[PDB]
Amino acid sequence: VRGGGKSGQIDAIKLGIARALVQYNPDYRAKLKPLGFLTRDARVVERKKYGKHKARRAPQYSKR
Amino acid sequence: WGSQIRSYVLDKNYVKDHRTGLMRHDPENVLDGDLMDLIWAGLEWKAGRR
Amino acid sequence: ARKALIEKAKRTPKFKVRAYTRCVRCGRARSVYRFFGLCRICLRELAHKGQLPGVRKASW
Amino acid sequence: SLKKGVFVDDHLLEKVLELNAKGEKRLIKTWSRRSTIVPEMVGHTIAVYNGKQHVPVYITENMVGHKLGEFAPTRTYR
Amino acid sequence: GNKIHPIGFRLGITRDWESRWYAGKKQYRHLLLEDQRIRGLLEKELYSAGLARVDIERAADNVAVTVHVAKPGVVIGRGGERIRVLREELAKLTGKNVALNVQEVQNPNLSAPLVAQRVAEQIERRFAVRRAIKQAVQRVMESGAKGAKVIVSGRIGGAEQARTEWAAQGRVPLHTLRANIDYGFALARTTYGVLGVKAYIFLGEV
Amino acid sequence: TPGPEAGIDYAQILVKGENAYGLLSPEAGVHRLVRPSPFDASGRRHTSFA
Amino acid sequence: GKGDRRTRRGKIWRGTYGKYRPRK
Amino acid sequence: ARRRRAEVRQLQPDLVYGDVLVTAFINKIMRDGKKNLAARIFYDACKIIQEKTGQEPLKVFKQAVENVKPRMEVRSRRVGGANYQVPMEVSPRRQQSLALRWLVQAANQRPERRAAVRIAHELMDAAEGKGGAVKKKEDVERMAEANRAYAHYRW
Amino acid sequence: KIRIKLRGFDHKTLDASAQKIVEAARRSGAQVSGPIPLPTRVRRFTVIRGPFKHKDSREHFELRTHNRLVDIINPNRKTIEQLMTLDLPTGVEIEIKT
RNA sequence: AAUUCUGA
RNA sequence: CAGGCCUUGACAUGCUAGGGAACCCGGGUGAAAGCCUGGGGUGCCCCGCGAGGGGAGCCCUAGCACAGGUGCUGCAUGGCCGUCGUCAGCUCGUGCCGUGAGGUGUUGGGUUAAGUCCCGCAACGAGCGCAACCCCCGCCGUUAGUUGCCAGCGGUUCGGCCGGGCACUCUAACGGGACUGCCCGCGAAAGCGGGAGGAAGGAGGGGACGACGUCUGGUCAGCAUGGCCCUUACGGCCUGGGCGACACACGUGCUACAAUGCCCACUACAAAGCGAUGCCACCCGGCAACGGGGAGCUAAUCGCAAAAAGGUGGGCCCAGUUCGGAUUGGGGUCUGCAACCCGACCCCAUGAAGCCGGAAUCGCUAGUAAUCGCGGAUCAGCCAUGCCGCGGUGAAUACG
Ligand SMILES: [Mg+2]
Ligand SMILES: [Mg+2]
Ligand SMILES: [Mg+2]
Ligand SMILES: [Mg+2]
Ligand SMILES: [Mg+2]
Ligand SMILES: [Mg+2]
Ligand SMILES: [Mg+2]
Ligand SMILES: [Mg+2]
Ligand SMILES: [Mg+2]
Ligand SMILES: [Mg+2]
Ligand SMILES: [Mg+2]
Ligand SMILES: [Mg+2]
Ligand SMILES: [Mg+2]
Ligand SMILES: [Mg+2]
Ligand SMILES: [Mg+2]
Ligand SMILES: [Mg+2]
Ligand SMILES: [Mg+2]
Ligand SMILES: [Mg+2]
Ligand SMILES: [Mg+2]
Ligand SMILES: [Mg+2]
Ligand SMILES: [Mg+2]
Ligand SMILES: [Mg+2]
Ligand SMILES: [Mg+2]
Ligand SMILES: [Mg+2]
Ligand SMILES: [Mg+2]
Ligand SMILES: [Zn+2]
């Protein structure tokens, strides 16, 4: 494995390993699905929009 | 009203001295020191009748 | 004081330092991108008019 | 911070060299504040400018490694 | 104080670069300038025919200069002299292959860039700025078009306080990409001040 | 005397020097001011007197 | 600290290198 | 949360005792997302349980949590220009939140050097019923029932 | 045995100028290796909308440089023809080596 | 149980 | 701003008069600008050997029509931008009621993120907006192999590097896909709830997009433009200063006040970009900044390069501290003509205030907050702790 961060690759490994045995085996669905080791996980660090220090956080509102 | 002897405008940048007729275009400068100009003239106008 | 400046702006002589940027379309001097040799205003202007080769509205 | 040379303006040296050879006057205006006070300069009173006028600054051998701007404050309320 | 340029908005689809060619990060600049001054002098000695676009291609020291027009019989003259004297001028500032096309328009009232200039004139002509819109639209619409729209800026008629004269017909969805709308803008300077001419022509789709 | 809402209500100051009076003398009088009222709601244009 | 010029994070945060953060 | 009644976030089992509770607690111990460090400490402490006591960590951490959950609490309220502090039961879902939280907070209100020790000791007391977390619990309860007067509102 | 670079901005002219040059030699001599598309170099620079000042609400533009690559193995002599002679550039860069 | 906002 | 200077001018079009007509090397005074000043020296239109000429590129001086003005007016204006508001709205055509202003549609019942849809209904449709087509990220396939790979074997200087080979990864450009379609329920419908399958639900997560209009909103100093006004100076050039002052007050931020910590040596895991007087491999002198040499690089082929938090071990052991790095003295490198005002770094010595912050007050609902490090534009250098991007670790809580 390569790219990203360790506690992030470990998560991808849990996908291939969960896709390796599902391939080379039948009884690997009705017990890997209700566990979903097969899912992808769209969760990705989202773009940093302009006028927002951290993508969603905003600058300090003063008014005064 | 109508008693002024020199008005000051800022949204049309100028300063009309009604007494003499003089009219500069720098209210901001006047209002901060610049006076030595209209002071002399102011006198000239006045001392004129004595 | 805008004309005589961009005129002395052109002349790139006397000490290789003073040699400074300057928008070409407009006489501006600030935020003058090196690539187009243009300023941040005469860039959003042309770009929209398509007149800038390959420059397309970014979006990701 | 300039370990190679002394970059001291020439129109000043050329001045404190002919005027130096057989030491004489002192009336010496300038704008070369940017320059260093090379050794020997002592005596000859430089009148550094400051954006407004020429401040007649004396020259002692304690202020040699120093420039000239450092003897004519540019602001008022020092 | 809003609304992107329908043109620059469709820059990737539904309207294409009015100047397509390649340039490295070593010359794109000089060439970009070149293309500019070209359009300059051209927009000068070529208003009698009033163009509406000036495309430009390259690939190896060449130049398209494909000047689309709505009255080519003028850009040429009486056979091929004007068109010949100009190719002359263009090359005068660039030792390049100063080619030069001269397309046309089967209907200039379906090309905003033109409709714009028209009204621009009328304004400086002291015409009824209102009907001057009612008509500049009743034209393009009468001559088929899924959408028209002309917007004039302040000084309408010369009244001290500036007003914006609007008016449109058909359908004009500047929010739908696949809509190929023609945006036309041109100035109209008068004795009392400047005016603004914005025209919207709705054409294609899907 | 820093008046109610804004500005002042009264002010009086000494001018220590020579011909100070002769200088600041023509000033004696009414001074008008025109600009949109920083106080008024819609920053409308009103005239001020002093 | 991120401001102690004479330290690891010192130069790191500084983006510079020195006796306290050499290049290998 | 004006539209939908939100939706409880589900945790992940513990990579050692495999417990949803055991994890929730670690997050509290977490600072700046440094979960790797938060996790360490916990176990680093669960060891201390063994160290100083024959007790069994997972079961100790279970009794403690229980002796911190506040039966009831007094939430503010508006009677009309009136903010009478009314009493009320503490939703199980909330009950646990508070519980876990106070533990950590209190755990740090200890004079111990290391952290593990704190988390440790703080749970060894609570589980018995004599820790800082329990105090800050009894209190939260004394308020309610003490205001059992304005409790005819509840709403 | 021949490396070719087709650096253009639009792909609807490379994935048509490359795949065009491909089977324009594939069928006229030694085989060839398909058009290998290499990573793009972009210019995602942003700019502030308003003319005056409004350091917020901006608009950014990017300049994409699409690169196409195709390498004809055995350099036929029946290839320095429909290729080295038949050029179809319209707004594309072409640099070939070996 | 909490006022006031002149005059283009 | 002070001071020294220039005049049809630093830029355009055009005119009268001899010299001058491409242009080069200078000497003098001076802070520079400027002023002043000595020598090399020209095809050509072409009677003509020539004496000679007009003379186009060309170019100097005096005079001229004009230039130039970040000088005023954003209530004289264009364009562009902010904002209410990513809000569910704003209107039109005909018909109908009304003396008329207007009303109706668009109100009502149900639903949705929505004037989204459904059902009603003197209204029947439609337009501008929401949606949708565009981009990016999640599954997958096809085209494509100098990224990759003992994946299968082989030699291996034992480095995917070499034959080999593109299966994978990846790269890039065209596609497949998700539609409340399928099961159960309520419902007139729209549609809501629950289940299966699937990478993914019911808008999958991000963008771009921001209606008629509001603020006589902002900008005549980016540009443009009407009027007013300066035209040996409100134009122009140069040297020096200032915009970086300091009794103070506010907004936005950086680093901390420390053991979930700091210092040190060792060891891993990224993404998106940028690079030919640019990035610098590796050497070598130096405590180091950096300076000497020097290879590769039109750059998925070389370089910026190390990611950092993390992991291992070790040192502090609760102190104004091995916390914190302000201020200051001293010594140096580098960019630049030149860093005193006023540069960024480096090293020795200082080590300040700060033991969690009054009244108040801001941001965020998930790969978000918090936290760690990197990149770019600008650009000689740089006052970036800013702005715009990228990924690494990764929460709490939502009754209402
Ligand atoms: Mg982040
Ligand atoms: Mg603000
Ligand atoms: Mg000027
Ligand atoms: Mg000036
Ligand atoms: Mg510069
Ligand atoms: Mg306008
Ligand atoms: Mg009174
Ligand atoms: Mg009184
Ligand atoms: Mg909870
Ligand atoms: Mg009262
Ligand atoms: Mg009162
Ligand atoms: Mg009132
Ligand atoms: Mg002067
Ligand atoms: Mg205003
Ligand atoms: Mg209806
Ligand atoms: Mg109505
Ligand atoms: Mg829905
Ligand atoms: Mg609708
Ligand atoms: Mg202007
Ligand atoms: Mg200065
Ligand atoms: Mg400033
Ligand atoms: Mg070197
Ligand atoms: Mg300095
Ligand atoms: Mg606090
Ligand atoms: Mg803190
Ligand atoms: Zn510009």
Curated annotation (Swiss-Prot), chain B:
Subcellular locations according to the entry: Cytoplasm
Domain of life: Bacteria
Function noted in UniProt: Peptide chain release factor 2 directs the termination of translation in response to the peptide chain termination codons UGA and UAA. In endogenous ribosomes interacts with P-site tRNA and 23S rRNA. In the presence of truncated mRNA in the 70S ribosome, ArfA and RF2 interact such that the GGQ peptide hydrolysis motif of RF2 rises into the peptidyl-transferase center and releases the ribosome. Recruited to stalled E.coli 70S ribosomes by E.coli ArfA, but cannot be functionally accomodated in the peptidyl-transferase center. Note T.thermophilus probably does not encode arfA.
Family named by the database record: Belongs to the prokaryotic/mitochondrial release factor family.
Subunit structure: Interacts with the ribosome. Interacts with ribosomal protein L11. Recruited to stalled E.coli ribosomes by E.coli ArfA.
Name used for this protein in its record: Peptide chain release factor RF2
Residues represented out of the complete protein: 320 to 369 of 378
Curated annotation (Swiss-Prot), chain E:
GO MF, any single term: mRNA binding
GO annotation terms (biological process): translation
InterPro entries for the chain: KH_dom, KH_dom-like_a/b, KH_dom_type_2, KH_sf_prok-type, Ribosomal_S3_C_sf, Ribosomal_uS3_bac-typ, Ribosomal_uS3_C, Ribosomal_uS3_CS
Residues of the KH type-2 domain: 38-106
Source species, domain of life: Bacteria
Any matching Pfam family: KH_2
Protein family per UniProt: Belongs to the universal ribosomal protein uS3 family.
Protein name: Small ribosomal subunit protein uS3
Gene label: rpsC
Swiss-Prot record, chain G:
Subunit structure: Part of the 30S ribosomal subunit.
GO cellular component labels: ribonucleoprotein complex; ribosome
Highest taxon listed in the record's lineage: Bacteria
Disulfide links within the chain: none
Keyword Transmembrane assigned: no
Stated name of the protein: Small ribosomal subunit protein bTHX
Family: Belongs to the bacterial ribosomal protein bTHX family.
InterPro entries: Ribosomal_bTHX, Ribosomal_bTHX/bTHXc/bTHXm
Basic residues: compositionally biased ranges: 1-12
Keywords: Ribonucleoprotein, Ribosomal protein, RNA-binding, rRNA-binding
Coiled coil: none
Keyword Ribosomal protein: yes
Record lineage: Bacteria, Thermotogati, Deinococcota, Deinococci, Thermales
Name of the gene this protein is made from: rpsU
Region annotation Disordered: where it falls in the sequence: 1-24
Its biological purpose: Binds at the top of the head of the 30S subunit. It stabilizes a number of different RNA elements and thus is important for subunit structure.
GO molecular function: rRNA binding
Species this protein is from: Thermus thermophilus (strain ATCC 27634 / DSM 579 / HB8)
From Swiss-Prot, chain H:
Listed InterPro entries: Ribosomal_uS7, Ribosomal_uS7_bac/org-type, Ribosomal_uS7_CS, Ribosomal_uS7_dom, Ribosomal_uS7_dom_sf
Alphabetical UniProt keywords: Ribonucleoprotein, Ribosomal protein, RNA-binding, rRNA-binding, tRNA-binding
GO biological process: translation
Superkingdom of the source species: Bacteria
Pfam family, one: Ribosomal_S7
One Gene Ontology cellular component annotation held by this UniProt entry: small ribosomal subunit
UniProt-listed SUPFAM superfamilies: Ribosomal protein S7
One GO MF term: structural constituent of ribosome
Record note on quaternary structure: Part of the 30S ribosomal subunit. Contacts proteins S9 and S11. Binds to the C-terminus of IF3 and to the C-terminus of Era.
Family named by the database record: Belongs to the universal ribosomal protein uS7 family.
Function recorded in the entry: One of the primary rRNA binding proteins, it binds directly to 3'-end of the 16S rRNA where it nucleates assembly of the head domain of the 30S subunit. Is located at the subunit interface close to the decoding center. Binds mRNA and the E site tRNA blocking its exit path in the ribosome. This blockage implies that this section of the ribosome must be able to move to release the deacetylated tRNA.
The protein's name: Small ribosomal subunit protein uS7
Species: Thermus thermophilus (strain ATCC 27634 / DSM 579 / HB8)
